[PDB]
Amino acid sequence: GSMKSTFKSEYPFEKRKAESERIADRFKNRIPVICEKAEKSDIPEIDKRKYLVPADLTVGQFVYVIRKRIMLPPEKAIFIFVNDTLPPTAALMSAIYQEHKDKDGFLYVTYSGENTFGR
């Protein structure tokens, strides 16, 4: 038939579009943040493409959720850096976005388990 078989296994939750509605009202202030994966990293490519980040989001908050996003174990950890830059946790995304604001308005961030830097 044309219809579809509803099942919990498939978990159409995310497949639903109504979600965007509630999120559109619950989260008014948001910025287009796109996390990319480096080529010289052993970190797996995250499934979630777009990341609805609020204008009041902080680096620390993003890093905390990140671990839960990739279901990464405690044995290891990862961090997000923009243009080879790793700002503090207090650093507000809304502030870092205006600085690294793409030529056509767009936040660019990279996630990995390394910084390739030293002390």
Side-chain angles (χ1 to χ4, degrees), residues 34-49 51 70 78-81 108-114:
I34 299 300
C35 238
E36 292 189 74
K37 178 183 126 52
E39 302 183 42
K40 197 185 179 171
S41 85
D42 199 49
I43 205 163
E45 215 212 49
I46 304 171
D47 204 282
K48 180 148 272 297
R49 192 159 287 167
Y51 311 95
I70 325 189
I78 43 180
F79 33 92
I80 324 304
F81 75 92
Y108 280 103
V109 280
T110 330
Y111 80 103
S112 183
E114 43 181 33

Side-chain angles (χ1 to χ4, degrees), residues 57-61 63-64 87-92:
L57 204 282
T58 62
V59 173
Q61 215 178 122
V63 180
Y64 272 124
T89 74
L92 227 289

Side-chain angles (χ1 to χ4, degrees), residues 68-83:
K68 209 193 193 182
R69 189 82 278 162
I70 325 189
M71 317 294 201
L72 216 58
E75 297 202 28
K76 296 214 78 175
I78 43 180
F79 33 92
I80 324 304
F81 75 92
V82 54
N83 284 1

